[PDB]
Design an enzyme around this catalytic site. Structure first.
Site, short mmCIF file in Angstrom:
data_model
loop_
_atom_site.label_atom_id
_atom_site.label_comp_id
_atom_site.label_asym_id
_atom_site.label_seq_id
_atom_site.Cartn_x
_atom_site.Cartn_y
_atom_site.Cartn_z
N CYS A 1 75.70 -6.20 -19.73
CA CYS A 1 74.99 -5.96 -20.97
C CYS A 1 75.96 -6.21 -22.12
CB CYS A 1 74.39 -4.55 -20.96
SG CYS A 1 72.95 -4.42 -19.86
N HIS B 1 64.84 3.57 -7.57
CA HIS B 1 65.69 3.69 -6.38
C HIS B 1 65.03 4.54 -5.30
CE1 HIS B 1 66.10 7.59 -8.09
NE2 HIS B 1 66.75 8.00 -7.00
C1 1D0 Z 1 63.18 6.84 -11.91
C2 1D0 Z 1 63.89 8.11 -11.58
N1 1D0 Z 1 65.19 8.21 -11.83
C3 1D0 Z 1 65.84 9.35 -11.54
C4 1D0 Z 1 65.22 10.45 -11.00
C5 1D0 Z 1 66.01 11.69 -10.71
O1 1D0 Z 1 66.05 11.95 -9.28
P1 1D0 Z 1 67.40 11.82 -8.46
O2 1D0 Z 1 67.81 10.39 -8.50
O3 1D0 Z 1 67.02 12.27 -7.09
O4 1D0 Z 1 68.39 12.71 -9.10
C6 1D0 Z 1 63.84 10.36 -10.73
C7 1D0 Z 1 63.12 11.55 -10.14
N2 1D0 Z 1 61.67 11.54 -9.97
C8 1D0 Z 1 61.10 12.42 -9.24
C9 1D0 Z 1 61.69 13.75 -9.04
N3 1D0 Z 1 62.39 13.82 -7.79
C10 1D0 Z 1 62.91 14.99 -7.38
C11 1D0 Z 1 63.86 15.67 -8.13
C12 1D0 Z 1 64.31 16.90 -7.68
C13 1D0 Z 1 63.81 17.44 -6.52
C14 1D0 Z 1 62.87 16.76 -5.77
C15 1D0 Z 1 62.41 15.53 -6.20
O5 1D0 Z 1 61.48 14.80 -5.53
C16 1D0 Z 1 59.93 12.16 -8.60
O6 1D0 Z 1 59.33 13.04 -8.02
O7 1D0 Z 1 59.55 11.04 -8.66
C17 1D0 Z 1 63.18 9.17 -11.03
O8 1D0 Z 1 61.86 8.98 -10.80
#
Ligand code: 1D0
Ligand code: F9F
Ligand code: CL
Ligand code: CL
Ligand code: CL
Ligand code: CL
Ligand code: CL
Ligand code: CL
Ligand code: CL
Ligand code: CL
Ligand code: CL
Ligand code: CL
Ligand code: CL
Ligand code: CL
Ligand code: CL
Ligand code: CL
Ligand code: CL
Ligand code: CS
Ligand code: CS
Ligand code: CS
Ligand code: CS
Lengths: 396, 268
Positions: free
Chosen positions: A61, A85
Site C-alpha cells: 500500500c 479469514h
Molecule cells: C471479518 C472479521 N474480522 C475479524 C473478526 C474477529 O474475530 P477473530 O479473528 O476470531 O479475532 C471477525 C469476527 N466475526 C465474528 C465473531 N467471531 C467470534 C468472536 C469471538 C468469539 C466467537 C466468535 O465466533 C463472527 O461471528 O463472524 C470478523 O468477521
C-alpha cells in the site's frame, strides 16, 4: 487426560460440564490424527486452494504511506471466498467433523461472518448446519442471516441472557452437551475450551506462513511487525503463529477501544479486563466486580466479545506479543483512508488493525519500518453502518 | 459439619430415599425466595440445592435459564445470596445446603475465599457446573479445607477411571447424572443407572443422588429402587414458581403439594 497441553501458561483449560469432556477428547484425538494424515492435509489444501482461492495476495500500500519511512503490506484475507479469514478454519473443522463420522454442524456467530463460513462449508461438504445467534444479532444482521439460510443452514435466535454472542456461545455448548454423538461444534475463534484454541490456530496458520514467504520474496527480510485485530483471536493467531519463533518480528494485536477505554464501553479484556473462567476457558474477561460476564462494545460486531483466546493472554504475559486498542473513531478514519487511497473497502474489524499501523507510521514518520496488517475481511458488510455514521456526523 | 452424612444415616435407618429440590436463590425475589425455601423444607425436602444467579448458566435448560433471569430482574447479586444462605442456615440447623455454582463466581474473588465464605454461612456442598474432574483440583482442595463437600458429576457416559475419580474425590453425595444435555423436566433420562450406582458403592463413593429430568414421584421411587440414596428435582419445582408468579399464595400451595408427593415417593 489429554494428548496436548490444554493450557498456554496459566490460560486456557477445559472448563466445560463433565458431560462434554468425551466430546473434547474425541475432537483432540481426531485433530492430532488428522495433522499426521497426508490424505486429510491434501483434502484441506485442495479446498483452501480451489474452493477458497488460497494463496491470498499480499498488497503493498504505497499511497497511504507516501512521505514516510513506513512500508505497509496488507495480507488480503478479504479476497478469500466468503470475504474473511473465517473460511479457512471452517473448512478444516468441517473435515474434522467428517473424520469423526459426524453429520451435523453447530456454530455460534455474532456479526454473522463465521456463521456464513460455517454455512458455506456445510453446504459444500454435506453437513447439516445449525447456527446459534443472539436475537439482538439476528435483528441487526438480516443480510448475513439470509446468506446463511440461502446456503441451507438453520439459524436459531438465542433469547436468553443479553441475547448476543456470549449467549449464542452458551446455547451452542448446551446443544452440543446433548448432541455430541452426531454433531460437531464448529467454534468460530481461537478461544473456548481446549482443543479449540489450538485447532483454530493450526487451521489459520497459513495466513502467517504465506505472509512470511511473500515478504521474503518481495522485501528479502521478515517484517518488523505484523498487526491484527483481536476479536476472539483467530485472525491474529493465524497471522502470528509462523512468526512466533522469529523473535525480531513484532506481533501486535489490536483490541477494540469502543468509545474509549476510560468509558468502559470497549472490547479490550486482554489489557483492560480481569482473568475469569467462562466459555470453557480461563482468560481475560470483561466482567462486573462480582464476576458476572459484562457486555463488551465496539462499532465493529466482529470484535464485540468480552473475552479473548488464551494463547493471546499467554503471549502477552511473556512479552512475546504486544496488545493495544483502537477506538471506534480511529477505526472509522482508517476505513475511510483505505477506501479513498487504496481502493480497498476493509472490514471495520480489520480497520482497527490498519488504524494502529497508521498510528505507528504517523507518530514516527521517519522511522524505517516494514509492517504487515492482516486485512482479515472486506467491508461490504459495513457500508450501511459507515453511511449512517458519516451522515449523522454531517459529512452526509 | 457432617450434614449429608447425618442425613443419609438417618434416611438409611428409616429406609427412605432423599428428596432434594433445586431452586434459584432470589427467584422471583429475595423475600419470596426465602418463603419458597421454607415451604420446600416444611413440605418434606431432605436437603436443598440452591443456585446463585449467573449471567451464563450453560448447563441449564430454559426453565432454569429463566429463573436466573427472574432473579436478575429482581436485582439479586451473589453477596445478597450469601446473606440469604446465612439466614436459611440460622433457621434450619441440620438440612444439607448445596450450592450450584458456575466457575467464574467461585474464582472471581479467589477460590479459597469463596469456600471460606461458604463455610462461614453454613453451606455443606458446592457443585461447580462448568468444572469437570479434570479441572477440579483447586476447587476440591479449597472445598475440603473449608469443610465443604465438593460435588462431582458421574455422567451416563462415564468409565471406570472416572468412576474411581469421582468416588475418591467426592464428598457429601455423588451427583448421578440421568442423561446428557442440560437441566429440564421436558426430557426424562432413558438410561438404567444401577450399574453406575453399584460401582460407586464398590469404590466407596459418596451416596448417589440422581438428577436431571426428575419431575414425577415414580422417578423418585425408581431412583431409590435402583440403589441411589435419593433424587434431585429442579426444573419441575421452578416451573411451579414460573406458573404462579401472579399468585404468591398459590405458588406456595402447589410447591407444598408437589414436594409432599415427591417426598412421599421416597419413603416407599
Ligand atoms: C471479518 C472479521 N474480522 C475479524 C473478526 C474477529 O474475530 P477473530 O479473528 O476470531 O479475532 C471477525 C469476527 N466475526 C465474528 C465473531 N467471531 C467470534 C468472536 C469471538 C468469539 C466467537 C466468535 O465466533 C463472527 O461471528 O463472524 C470478523 O468477521
Ligand atoms: O430437574 P432438572 O432437570 O432441572 O435438574 C436439576 C439440576 N439442578 S442442580 O442444581 O442439581 C444441577 C446439577 C448439575 C448441573 O450441571 C452439571 F451437571 F453440568 F454440573 C446443573 C444443575
Ligand atoms: Cl499433554
Ligand atoms: Cl501464564
Ligand atoms: Cl495449569
Ligand atoms: Cl503429515
Ligand atoms: Cl505435500
Ligand atoms: Cl432472512
Ligand atoms: Cl438438540
Ligand atoms: Cl520454509
Ligand atoms: Cl524460494
Ligand atoms: Cl516488543
Ligand atoms: Cl449482570
Ligand atoms: Cl519473548
Ligand atoms: Cl476523498
Ligand atoms: Cl529507522
Ligand atoms: Cl414438563
Ligand atoms: Cs513509504
Ligand atoms: Cs521489531
Ligand atoms: Cs474482544
Ligand atoms: Cs468418598
Amino acid at each position: 487426560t489429554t494428548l496436548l497441553n490444554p493450557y498456554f501458561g496459566e490460560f486456557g483449560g477445559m472448563y466445560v460440564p463433565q458431560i462434554l469432556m468425551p466430546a473434547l477428547n474425541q475432537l483432540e484425538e481426531a485433530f492430532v490424527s488428522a495433522q499426521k494424515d497426508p490424505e486429510f492435509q491434501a483434502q484441506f489444501a485442495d479446498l483452501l486452494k480451489n474452493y477458497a482461492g488460497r494463496p491470498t495476495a499480499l498488497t503493498k500500500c504505497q499511497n497511504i504511506t507516501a512521505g514516510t519511512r513506513t512500508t505497509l503490506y496488507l495480507k488480503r484475507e478479504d479476497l478469500l471466498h466468503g470475504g474473511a479469514h473465517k473460511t479457512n478454519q471452517v473448512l478444516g473443522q468441517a473435515l474434522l467433523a467428517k473424520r469423526m463420522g459426524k453429520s451435523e454442524i453447530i456454530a455460534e456467530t455474532g456479526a454473522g461472518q463465521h456463521g456464513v463460513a460455517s454455512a458455506l462449508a456445510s453446504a459444500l461438504l454435506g453437513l447439516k448446519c445449525r447456527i446459534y445467534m443472539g436475537a439482538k444479532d439476528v435483528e441487526r444482521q438480516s443480510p448475513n442471516v439470509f446468506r446463511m439460510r440461502l446456503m441451507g443452514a438453520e439459524v436459531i435466535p438465542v433469547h436468553s441472557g443479553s441475547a448476543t454472542l456470549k449467549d449464542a456461545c452458551n446455547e451452542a455448548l448446551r446443544d452440543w452437551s446433548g448432541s455430541y454423538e452426531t454433531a460437531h461444534y464448529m467454534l468460530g475463534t481461537a478461544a473456548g475450551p481446549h482443543p479449540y484454541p489450538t485447532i483454530v490456530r493450526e487451521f489459520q496458520r497459513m495466513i502467517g506462513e504465506e505472509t512470511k514467504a511473500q515478504i521474503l520474496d518481495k522485501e528479502g527480510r521478515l517484517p518488523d511487525a505484523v498487526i491484527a485485530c483481536v476479536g476472539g483471536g483467530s485472525n491474529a493467531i493465524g497471522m502470528f503463529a509462523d512468526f512466533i519463533n522469529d523473535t525480531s518480528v513484532g506481533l501486535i494485536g489490536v483490541e477494540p477501544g469502543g468509545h474509549g477505554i476510560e468509558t468502559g464501553e470497549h472490547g479490550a479484556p486482554l489489557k483492560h479486563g480481569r482473568v475469569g473462567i467462562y466459555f470453557g476457558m480461563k482468560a481475560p474477561m470483561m466482567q462486573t466486580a462480582d464476576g458476572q460476564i459484562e457486555e463488551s462494545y465496539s462499532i465493529s460486531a466482529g470484535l464485540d466479545f468480552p473475552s479473548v483466546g488464551p494463547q493471546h493472554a499467554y503471549l502477552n504475559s511473556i512479552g512475546r506479543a504486544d496488545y493495544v486498542s483502537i477506538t471506534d473513531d480511529e477505526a472509522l478514519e482508517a476505513f475511510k483512508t483505505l477506501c479513498r487511497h487504496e481502493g480497498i473497502i476493509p472490514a471495520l474489524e480489520s480497520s482497527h488493525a490498519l488504524a494502529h499501523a497508521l498510528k505507528m507510521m504517523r507518530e514516527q514518520p521517519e522511522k524505517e519500518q516494514l509492517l504487515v496488517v492482516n486485512l482479515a475481511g472486506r467491508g461490504d458488510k459495513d457500508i450501511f453502518t459507515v453511511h449512517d455514521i458519516l451522515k449523522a456526523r454531517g459529512e452526509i | 459439619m457432617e450434614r449429608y452424612e447425618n442425613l443419609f444415616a438417618q434416611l438409611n435407618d428409616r429406609r427412605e430415599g432423599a428428596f432434594v429440590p433445586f431452586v434459584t436463590l432470589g427467584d422471583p425475589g429475595i423475600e419470596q425466595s426465602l418463603k419458597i425455601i421454607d415451604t420446600l423444607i416444611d413440605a418434606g425436602a431432605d436437603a436443598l440445592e440452591l443456585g446463585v444467579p449467573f449471567s451464563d448458566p450453560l448447563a441449564d435448560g430454559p426453565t432454569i435459564q429463566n429463573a436466573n433471569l427472574r432473579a436478575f430482574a429482581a436485582g439479586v447479586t451473589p453477596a445478597q445470596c450469601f446473606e440469604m444462605l446465612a439466614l436459611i442456615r440460622e433457621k434450619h440447623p441440620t438440612i444439607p445446603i448445596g450450592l450450584l455454582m458456575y466457575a467464574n463466581l467461585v474464582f472471581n474473588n479467589g477460590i479459597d475465599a469463596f469456600y471460606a465464605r461458604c463455610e462461614q454461612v453454613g453451606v455443606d456442598s458446592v457443585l461447580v457446573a462448568d468444572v469437570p474432574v479434570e479441572e477440579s483440583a483447586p476447587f476440591r482442595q479449597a472445598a475440603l479445607r473449608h469443610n465443604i463437600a465438593p460435588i462431582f458429576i458421574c455422567p451416563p457416559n462415564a468409565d471406570d477411571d472416572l468412576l474411581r475419580q469421582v468416588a475418591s474425590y467426592g464428598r457429601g453425595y455423588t451427583y448421578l447424572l440421568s442423561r446428557s444435555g442440560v437441566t429440564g423436566a421436558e426430557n426424562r433420562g432413558a438410561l438404567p443407572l444401577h450399574h453406575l450406582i453399584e460401582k460407586l458403592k464398590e469404590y466407596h463413593a459418596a451416596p448417589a443422588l440422581q438428577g436431571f429430568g426428575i419431575s414425577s414421584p415414580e422417578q423418585v421411587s425408581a431412583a431409590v429402587r435402583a440403589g441411589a440414596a435419593g433424587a434431585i428435582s429442579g426444573s419441575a419445582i421452578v416451573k411451579i414458581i414460573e406458573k404462579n408468579l401472579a399468585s404468591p399464595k398459590q405458588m406456595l400451595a402447589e410447591l407444598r403439594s408437589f414436594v409432599s408427593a415427591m417426598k412421599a415417593a421416597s419413603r416407599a
